[PDB]
Give the backbone structure.
Amino acid sequence: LTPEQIIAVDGAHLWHPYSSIGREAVSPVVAVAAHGAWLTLIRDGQPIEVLDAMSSWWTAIHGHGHPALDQALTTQLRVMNHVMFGGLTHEPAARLAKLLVDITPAGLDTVFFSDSGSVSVEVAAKMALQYWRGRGLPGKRRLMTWRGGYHGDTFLAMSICDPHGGMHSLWTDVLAAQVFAPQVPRDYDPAYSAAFEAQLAQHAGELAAVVVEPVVQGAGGMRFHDPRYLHDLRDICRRYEVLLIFDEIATGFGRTGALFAADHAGVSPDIMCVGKALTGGYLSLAATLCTADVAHTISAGAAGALMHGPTFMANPLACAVSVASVELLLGQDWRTRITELAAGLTAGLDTARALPAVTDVRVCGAIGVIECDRPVDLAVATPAALDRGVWLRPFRNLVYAMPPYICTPAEITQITSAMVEVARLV
Amino acid sequence: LTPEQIIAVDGAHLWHPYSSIGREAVSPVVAVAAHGAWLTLIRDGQPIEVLDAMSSWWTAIHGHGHPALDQALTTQLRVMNHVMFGGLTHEPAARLAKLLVDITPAGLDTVFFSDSGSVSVEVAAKMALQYWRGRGLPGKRRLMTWRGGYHGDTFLAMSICDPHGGMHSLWTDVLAAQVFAPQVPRDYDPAYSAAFEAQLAQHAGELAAVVVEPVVQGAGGMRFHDPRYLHDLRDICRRYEVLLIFDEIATGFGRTGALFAADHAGVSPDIMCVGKALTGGYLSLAATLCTADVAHTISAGAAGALMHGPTFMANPLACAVSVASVELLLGQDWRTRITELAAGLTAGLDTARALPAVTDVRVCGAIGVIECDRPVDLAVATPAALDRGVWLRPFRNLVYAMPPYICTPAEITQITSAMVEVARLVGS
Ligand SMILES: *Cc1c(COP(=O)(O)O)cnc(C)c1O
Ligand SMILES: *Cc1c(COP(=O)(O)O)cnc(C)c1O
Ligand SMILES: CC(=O)Nc1ccc2c(c1)C=CC2=O
């Protein structure tokens, strides 16, 4: 298929994330290649190389086509593509589970693999709910969160997504009605935590778990909060006997300047989800981790088993490329790398602070955000970044990047300048 | 790691499907290789070649390590592992969408890629809900199905699983309350269809959709039903204006003897799900298809869009191997192949009918079922099939197989013989 034939087929037959068929002011750009930190896109019939400033939606932490990750995939392909995980186990699953148990916040001892972040979140909720039935408290079945969050697109995951971001308006009422605390602020205010505790207190007997994104709220608006709020949640969840779930699907594997965002706070959740960067952006894969107590309580319970089992659970190919991805991250000084990227983003985005349309410029690890005072027009922003050799995808009033860890200073400089110039045009 | 080191790590850290941690009656068996129809398993410290009679849970239709599928994967890997599908498109997605639109039941013109069967089912439900909201009828929000079904493990998918049966039984208090018709019988009975219609009639104003597995109900009990029921369902859904959704996640890609099981009836659903065999069992991938009308109605509605978008949506690598798997199936006489597999299964399983613990033997394309009179003890059945060179995984009271299409006549008879012996052991 030629690029023009790809466009014709796509327009007629392909749905895209949160998109229409037949409407679409877009239309999407044909990608023909991806290597390192660069994508090859078709603009006016011609292939152009542009920086993947988004890491292809958080995924490509080591960049596309990393030789070590290509090799791990092809190596596994020669031995065993996939076997069913019902009644069988294998080396890739074992090696990955061992790695993930060792590097996650302490006490997360057991690993349940799935095929996407939304599924790992449902699994997390199912673990939490079965946990309390296993304790003789089936009333503990609702979830609590703070606003601004995003947890996935499946129906349970939607119920804890921000009611505006997730447009709960169009969903009244098919969704579970969950407990929402106000938006967690940027700066630390103990009054916020006190009010969170009081709100939780009156719901405690009906709550299975608090579920939040730690430090960084991604898809719901790229907000950062003081990690000390996670210490308070841990404390509140402990005292009131409610499980704590950290959704680290966007934040894990070094992205926020710590290995997991939880590490900023020195706290361990009872249940943890990981996903987007797990395979270094090659293949869909996720995992849900829980403590020994959670695993045993579920297992000793009436049901005697966690009632979940995706067809492709613990896929050898995705597990093997993930092993190589995690070892590649751990085998380098990743902390210095992220610090430098963060500094590169801080220096490059600085001039944007003075722009008349800009309300905030903020950085956390390898994440850089320019927040504006009005929606960013995509028909203006997108070609503008392309002219500058950068792939950027703004949403709402935000211009932002989550660049691959392998971006050089020159590349960060190029990413930031394109971001600044999108903000100038606003 | 060594096989015993894998076991040690696995017992301590790995959750398995529908299992406990630390209370597993049987240890899992270490798999170290898979090629063609054969797995290499570790048994008492020794590697053994066994047939993958399960197709690694319905997935490995072409067997493992097929040269055309390995190559399609390495070829895509060299060019583009993955890009974000928000604002971008690519050849693997376009080619696969083109294929799926052409081979599925007529009128299925749009394609939404996701990462798993359960997710594709939630996308189908979302499509149905948003469609009716687009039409100004937001009261049409419930789903109807028949008993015996399975649709995945995510919470909306659970709500249409068989409520007893039924693996998701102890959740009913927290699941959306759906409409359940009685178990669809094997043989065609016009009275079943009339009662289904009558039950649906009272909920029409609140039903978004009928959702069923066509012809074969898989994980809910390997039950077959007459394809004329699907014709009835189509006619009933048309007349009461309820969307029809076919979950072909288990049945797709030739498994039941037709390309899609809906084809046994000439029926086109409004929405369709595909998954397990989509990538030939290489990588996780699913798709949800819908009509142009359902798409345009969602698009012109308040949202202006289907409110769903998974991270790895239309993953280039998974799309590329699926393209190759579908072409491989289509470029051969798959129909004659499945017919021969079914005859082999029938001939091979026939002797089981006379066994004292057997209540039914049934075949439908490349699916063979010995239904026993008691639940099948895995601690007895697993080793017994291994001793005969076959990987079999019974569940509940069923000893069954869905072998790869590449199995020779002699491999099929080796599979069935091992199934007969397992069934013989259940009776003693
Ligand atoms: C992306 C994301 C999810 C959902 O992951 P998918 O793989 O897209 O289903 C859940 N939680 C968080 C925090 C995410 O960033
Ligand atoms: C296996 C299956 C599902 C769920 O698929 P996963 O990929 O395991 O989530 C849904 N529907 C049917 C009919 C299935 O056989
Ligand atoms: C448009 C929106 O609300 N979210 C998303 C925007 C873009 C993507 C995804 C989700 C998932 C992969 C993408 O590329």
DSSP finds 13 helices and 17 strands in chain B.
